[PDB]
């Protein structure tokens, strides 16, 4: 069908199984002093984390104070200059002998791809740095809130003192 | 190879986020009538803590199951209103999820 059937073990655990789970796990721990399914109550025991700390799904694999970059900058500048130079040479190829133009085209793309690889390694280095730009925005917002609070209560205190002087003069 | 129970339970949890899946599951009488399914739903509650929460793909179901948790003391009745209510309350529920995680 369109919707896959519920998992099979779901139907094994009634309320009686839930209430008898404590004594079952106590007995299992006493006896113990891929997990084989010898009893229907085994699944409620929390599954163990794999030792490899890896998870595979759909053909893909998955697994501290925040809680030479100049070399990478100059490499990206020279790569951009070389990319412009290669674009000029490739368009010249199109001008004179376009029949073999593709021979350079993908080459240029490789450089673009290498710039994209630098810009990929650069993500775990920008994504966390978003929390930094957030840091200064809430910090400056709270400083503005604080400063307008001592300002307003100081101007209230000044008004009170002026009133006190006015009433003392009228005495 | 045969996937482990981790993979199937995680995929079930992430598929629970679909409104069509929830409507289909609640359409059948014996799914809600059987206490086994709700017992499994309450068993699934323990994934809201790390490091299990780091393995989720769509955080919305995190509330949905919790919302489904509410369904055991709110009633089946209300099944018809489920798509409308999720569409209407998506903004504030997304905001509260962001407050729970992004802050």
């Amino acid at each position: 069908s369109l919707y896959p059937p519920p998992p099979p073990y779901v139907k094994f655990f009634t309320q009686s199984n839930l209430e008898k789970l404590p004594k079952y796990k106590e007995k299992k721990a006493a006896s113990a002093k891929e997990e084989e399914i010898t009893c229907a109550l085994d699944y409620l025991i929390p599954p163990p984390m794999p030792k490899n700390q890896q998870y595979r799904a759909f053909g893909s694999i998955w697994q501290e104070n925040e809680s030479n970059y100049q070399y990478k900058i100059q490499e990206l500048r020279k790569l951009l200059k070389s990319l412009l130079l290669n674009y000029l040479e490739l368009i010249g190829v199109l001008s004179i002998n376009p029949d073999m133009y593709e021979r350079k085209v993908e080459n240029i793309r490789t450089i673009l791809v290498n710039i994209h690889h630098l810009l990929n390694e650069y993500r775990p280095h920008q994504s966390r740095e978003s929390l930094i730009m957030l840091l200064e925005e809430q910090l400056e917002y709270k400083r503005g809130e604080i400063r307008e609070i001592e300002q307003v209560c100081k101007q209230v205190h000044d008004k009170l003192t002026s009133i006190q002087d006015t009433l003392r003069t009228g005495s | 190879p045969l996937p482990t129970r981790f993979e199937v339970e995680l995929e079930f949890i992430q598929s629970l986020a679909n409104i069509q899946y929830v409507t289909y599951l609640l359409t059948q009488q014996q799914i809600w009538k059987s206490p086994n399914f709700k017992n499994y739903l309450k068993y699934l509650e323990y994934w809201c803590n790390p490091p299990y929460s780091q393995c989720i793909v769509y955080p919305n179901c995190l509330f949905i199951l919790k919302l489904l948790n509410g369904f055991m003391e709110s009633a089946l009745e209300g099944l018809d209103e489920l798509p409308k209510i999720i569409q209407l309350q998506g903004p504030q529920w997304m905001n509260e999820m962001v407050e729970r995680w992004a802050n």
């Binding site: 369109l2 | 289909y24 359409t27 099944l79």
Partner: peptide, 25 residues
């Protein structure tokens, strides 16, 4: 003429019961 028209009694909240099954190829 027409004494009174009918009040709109639409029920969009009705969930419908369309059976879906031939999805797998």
């Amino acid at each position: 003429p027409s004494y009174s028209p009918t009040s709109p009694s639409y029920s969009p909240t009705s969930p419908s019961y369309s059976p879906t099954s031939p999805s797998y190829s």
